[PDB]
Design a binder for this molecule. Structure first.
Ligand SMILES: OC[C@H]1O[C@H](O)[C@@H](O)[C@@H](O)[C@@H]1O
Ligand code: CUO
Length: 382
């Protein structure tokens, strides 16, 4: 089993072999090279509708998002191992406070992880970190981990992961914030290895809880359909092709890799479960959002306001998207805890108050409030 470890626990030899194996994968023009694998995600569009119209293959806004991306990260991993890496794609634990992106990707000189070229666009990838990036993520992820149903976890998990994409890429034209070019920035793989790790920590929690972790009773339909393009005969990877259905991608152990550990924030699995329980011993009020495709990436900010017009910051969540993305709409609410904002405005759950929403494109332009239905507010008692 190939090990994925914390980027900051990498030995200098680990780093060198990774940088080397990555340089070779990037130079490789075969179907197992970088440009080809990166294409599975956005552009060049590699999937087609029955009518010949193409769309980006990555599954977002749906329950199979973890599954689809678990296979894509594995596809890139196998290629690196094949070029000499003796270690798996390391994970960048972004739920842990950080004052800067990991060194692995920031060193400019002779670093294959600093950027990649985008053949189709004839440029290199771009990053333009937003100040918000530098905890918030711990909170967004802990709410996801608290869930005991796959579909409820998935939505919190996916929206939380979107934030890294948006705040790293920023307004840059070819970076992490575009559905089209994210997969080209090598940081995408450190981000997605961590994202796969978060799903793995959740599967261990469920196991610990005595609840289903390798199957899901919700959305039972989508989990049996194939994950394009991993199911195609043209997929040179026999492992990802063999586990190309949502149903077959739950068990990562069958994918040949493992993590150095599943200790979320220094806590063991049973400690984390005790911790999340403590959280539910408090009454909480939540804003709930119904999300669907808007054909682009957007950041949403909202304030909680007393009727008299006194407001306080409510929260922020991001949507990763772009032109030609496949249609998507979640079948449940995305929950955001606003207990604090209320307490601040000295509001009571039953007081009448407003939630003011502002949707903004990645460039900075305000998008119509028409894209999003008005949020719901509900109480979640101890
Ligand atoms: O009643 C408000 C209504 O106005 C119009 C559209 O923006 C709808 O989506 C919105 O909910
Ligand atoms: O998933 Cu397609 O991007 Cu993180």
């Amino acid at each position: 089993a190939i090990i994925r470890k914390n980027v900051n626990s990498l030995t200098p030899s680990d780093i060198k072999e990774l940088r080397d194996a990555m340089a070779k994968v990037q130079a490789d023009t075969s179907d197992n090279g970088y440009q080809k694998i990166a294409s599975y995600h956005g552009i060049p569009l590699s999937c087609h509708y029955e009518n010949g119209t193409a769309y980006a293959c990555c599954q977002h806004g749906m329950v199979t998002f973890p599954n689809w991306h678990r296979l894509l990260t594995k596809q890139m991993e196998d290629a690196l191992v094949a070029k000499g890496s003796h270690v798996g794609i390391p994970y960048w634990d972004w739920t842990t406070t950080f004052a800067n992106l990991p060194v692995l990707v920031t060193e400019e000189k002779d670093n294959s992880f600093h950027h990649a070229h985008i053949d189709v666009a004839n440029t290199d990838t771009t990053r333009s970190p937003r100040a918000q990036l530098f905890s918030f993520f711990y909170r967004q992820i802990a709410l996801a981990l608290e869930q005991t149903d796959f579909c409820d976890f998935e939505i919190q998990f996916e929206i939380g992961h979107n934030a890294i994409h948006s705040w790293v890429g920023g307004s840059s034209p070819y970076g992490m914030s575009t559905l089209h070019y994210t997969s080209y920035d090598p940081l995408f793989y450190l981000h997605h290895s961590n994202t796969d790790r978060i799903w793995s920590v959740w599967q261990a929690l469920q196991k610990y809880r005595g609840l289903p972790y390798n199957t899901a009773n919700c959305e039972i339909n989508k989990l049996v359909k194939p994950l394009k393009p991993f199911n195609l005969d043209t997929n040179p990877n026999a492992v990802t092709k063999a586990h190309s259905t949502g149903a077959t991608s739950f068990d990562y152990h069958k994918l040949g890799y493992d993590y150095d550990n599943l200790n979320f924030h220094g806590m063991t699995i049973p400690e984390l479960e005790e911790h999340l329980k403590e959280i539910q011993h408090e009454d909480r009020v939540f804003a709930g959002f119904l999300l669907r495709t808007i054909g682009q990436s957007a950041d949403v900010n909202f304030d909680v306001c007393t009727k008299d017009g006194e407001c306080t910051f409510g929260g922020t969540f991001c949507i990763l998207g772009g032109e030609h993305e496949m249609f998507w709409a979640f079948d449940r609410l995305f929950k955001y805890d606003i207990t604090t904002s209320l307490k601040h405005l000295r509001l009571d759950a039953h007081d009448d108050f407003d939630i003011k929403v502002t949707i903004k494109g990645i460039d900075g332009h305000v998008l119509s409030n028409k894209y999003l239905s008005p949020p719901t507010v509900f109480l979640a008692p101890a």
